[PDB]
Amino acid sequence: EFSMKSVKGLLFIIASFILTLLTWMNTSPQFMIPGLALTSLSLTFILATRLPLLESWFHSLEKVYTVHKFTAFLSIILLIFHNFSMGGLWGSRLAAQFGNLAIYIFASIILVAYLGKYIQYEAWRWIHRLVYLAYILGLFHIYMIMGNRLLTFNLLSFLVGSYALLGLLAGFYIIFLYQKISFPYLGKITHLKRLNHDTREIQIHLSRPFNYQSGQFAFLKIFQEGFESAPHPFSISGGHGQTLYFTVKTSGDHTKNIYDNLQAGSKVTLDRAYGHMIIEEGRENQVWIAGGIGITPFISYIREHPILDKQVHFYYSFRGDENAVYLDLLRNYAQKNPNFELHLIDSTKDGYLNFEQKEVPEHATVYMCGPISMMKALAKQIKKQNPKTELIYEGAKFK
Numbered sequence: 321e322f323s324m325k326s327v328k329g330l331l332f333i334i335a336s337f338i339l340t341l342l343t344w345m346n347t348s349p350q351f352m353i354p355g356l357a358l359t360s361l362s363l364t365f366i367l368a369t370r371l372p373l374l375e376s377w378f379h380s381l382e383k384v385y386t387v388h389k390f391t392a393f394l395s396i397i398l399l400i401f402h403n404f405s406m407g408g409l410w411g412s413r414l415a416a417q418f419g420n421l422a423i424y425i426f427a428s429i430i431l432v433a434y435l436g437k438y439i440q441y442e443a444w445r446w447i448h449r450l451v452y453l454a455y456i457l458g459l460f461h462i463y464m465i466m467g468n469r470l471l472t473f474n475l476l477s478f479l480v481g482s483y484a485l486l487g488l489l490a491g492f493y494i495i496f497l498y499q500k501i502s503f504p505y506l507g508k509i510t511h512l513k514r515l516n517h518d519t520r521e522i523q524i525h526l527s528r529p530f531n532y533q534s535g536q537f538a539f540l541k542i543f544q545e546g547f548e549s550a551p552h553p554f555s556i557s558g559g560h561g562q563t564l565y566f567t568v569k570t571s572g573d574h575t576k577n578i579y580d581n582l583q584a585g586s587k588v589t590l591d592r593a594y595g596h597m598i599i600e601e602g603r604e605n606q607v608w609i610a611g612g613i614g615i616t617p618f619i620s621y622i623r624e625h626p627i628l629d630k631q632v633h634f635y636y637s638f639r640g641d642e643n644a645v646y647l648d649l650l651r652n653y654a655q656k657n658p659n660f661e662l663h664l665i666d667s668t669k670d671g672y673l674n675f676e677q678k679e680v681p682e683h684a685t686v687y688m689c690g691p692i693s694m695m696k697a698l699a700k701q702i703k704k705q706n707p708k709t710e711l712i713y714e715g716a717k718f719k
């Protein structure tokens with residue numbers, strides 16, 4: 321659920337829609353609905369550009385891509401009613417046929433984007449990048465149809481041109497420029513350690529210091545023979561200055577390649593730190609809940625804060641003793657810090673993590689990381705006991 325932490329972004333979108341509606345209604349009322357869809361198409365491209373101001377307005381990157389999907393579905397709904405009320409399956413002029421091609425690509429990509437869970441991510445991304453061709457085709461359709469009406473000195477020309485230019489510049493940056501210029505942190509892998517049968521820890525030495533807060537993540541691009549160079553998001557699992565740690569559990573084809581084939585010395589590139597789950601920014605009393613490899617944001621805090629200044633209760637859940645990581649680190653940290661409580665929950669042995677009879681501290685923030693299904697159940701039970709509790713959760717999926 322959205323809140324005031326994402327109200328700057330929401331007010332920007334409603335300002336974009338209200339201003340577009342007023343500009344069209346006062347100039348060309350017959351084109352309010354196609355005009356509104358072009359603004360939504362512009363905002364969808366902006367919301368996919370991955371800019372620091374984007375997540376500063378929409379709180380988290382998960383909420384950025386949720387709105388990115390909402391403006392995508394609003395666009396196709398308005399374009400379908402544009403096509404239904406203004407034309408047919410195929411157009412008679414070249415200008416109309418450009419809008420026919422664009423709507424076919426827009427509907428085909430949106431259909432594939434939604435029910436494309438089983439496709440490979442890079443194949444999905446390449447298919448997804450066809451909206452730029454449809455977006456360009458739509459811009460030809462608009463400017464061939466409304467010739468000399470959006471190329472004068474008036475409000476409508478400035479409004480249509482600016483949003484069309486912003487979407488054109490946003491689509492070019494993320495598709496052709498983001499992975500080439502927005503990855504300024506060049507580094508190489510120094511040491512690699514296998515924690516358990518399916519998790520590997522990567523130590524990276526960067527040529528320049530990396531600034532991040534515990535609980536934040538980055539995007540990793542590995543440059544090795546036999547490795548894909550696409551960016552994968554990983555939580556920073558420790559390190560300071562020119563040293564970064566990443567803890568990767570085999571989840572698919574790339575993460576199994578990291579476990580088995582990754583070698584020390586391979587070049588890596590980082591873009592910047594993302595994330596709203598800043599542990600240091602929480603209350604004095606904190607509750608940490610981690611599931612499986614969701615412990616990685618909490619390992620950065622433990623490594624970087626040898627003395628704990630907060631009242632932290634840690635609830636770690638793992639699939640038996642064979643799927644637990646950093647067990648000696650957590651035991652050593654609890655011994656050094658009296659104000660740190662460790663609660664190891666073997667799912668097979670102990671059972672389920674339940675907060676019904678458990679008591680949360682008064683005026684405490686709950687940081688939750690792990691499976692989405694397990695987090696939702698846990699978040700519900702905490703709110704019944706103390707509705708004033710502040711709950712912060714980070715997921716591992718954008719789609």
Ligand SMILES: Cc1cc2nc3c(=O)[nH]c(=O)nc-3n(C[C@H](O)[C@H](O)[C@H](O)COP(=O)(O)OP(=O)(O)OC[C@H]3O[C@@H](n4cnc5c(N)ncnc54)[C@H](O)[C@@H]3O)c2cc1C
Nearest residue numbers: 441551552553554555568569571572573574575616716717
């Ligand atoms: C904010 C965040 C933090 C994360 N932190 C960690 C971490 O500390 N440790 C860890 O092991 N994993 C972490 N992940 C998950 C990690 O990004 C994926 O598990 C990994 O990219 C899967 O690689 P694969 O291609 O082998 O998996 P696949 O089998 O190809 O993918 C399966 C799942 O991974 C997703 N996925 C695949 N490729 C990408 C990609 N390039 N970008 C985004 N999602 C992708 C798919 O949507 C699907 O849900 C994090 C994810 C997010 C969003």
Ligand SMILES: NC(=O)C1=CN([C@@H]2O[C@H](COP(=O)(O)OP(=O)(O)OC[C@H]3O[C@@H](n4cnc5c(N)ncnc54)[C@H](OP(=O)(O)O)[C@@H]3O)[C@@H](O)[C@H]2O)C=CC1
Nearest residue numbers: 555611612613614637638639667673690691694714715716
């Ligand atoms: N910041 C981020 O976004 C980060 C994302 N991640 C993601 O975190 C995820 C964690 O998954 P993984 O490492 O495989 O861990 P698992 O899902 O395998 O284990 C997590 C634990 O949750 C328990 N659990 C599941 N459902 C419930 C429930 N309803 N109530 C209580 N306990 C429950 C399981 O016990 P049981 O066997 O009884 O179900 C299990 O021990 C990964 O998908 C990873 O990609 C990783 C790092 C950080």
Ligand code: HEM
Nearest residue numbers: 364365368385389392395430433434449451494495718719
């Ligand atoms: C008019 C509709 C849409 C447009 C114009 C659009 C545009 C884009 C673009 C250009 C990208 C970046 C591609 C790249 O990095 O190469 C992107 C990313 C993304 N889009 Fe869309 N999209 C649309 C619809 C959708 C829909 C329907 C979904 C449904 C899930 C979706 C989910 C995503 C996600 C999750 C990403 C993140 C990609 C990543 O993690 O690498 N988009 N979008």
Ligand code: HEM
Nearest residue numbers: 351354355403406407408410411416419420422423458465
């Ligand atoms: C400000 C935005 C827009 C304006 C002013 C506009 C204007 C028009 C006009 C006048 C027509 C009538 C076609 C004809 O001359 O016979 C038309 C048709 C159409 N437009 Fe647009 N349009 C806009 C946006 C879009 C966009 C962005 C798309 C597609 C992505 C689109 C898709 C279509 C389709 C499919 C038709 C039907 C073509 C046909 O059957 O002949 N429109 N538009």
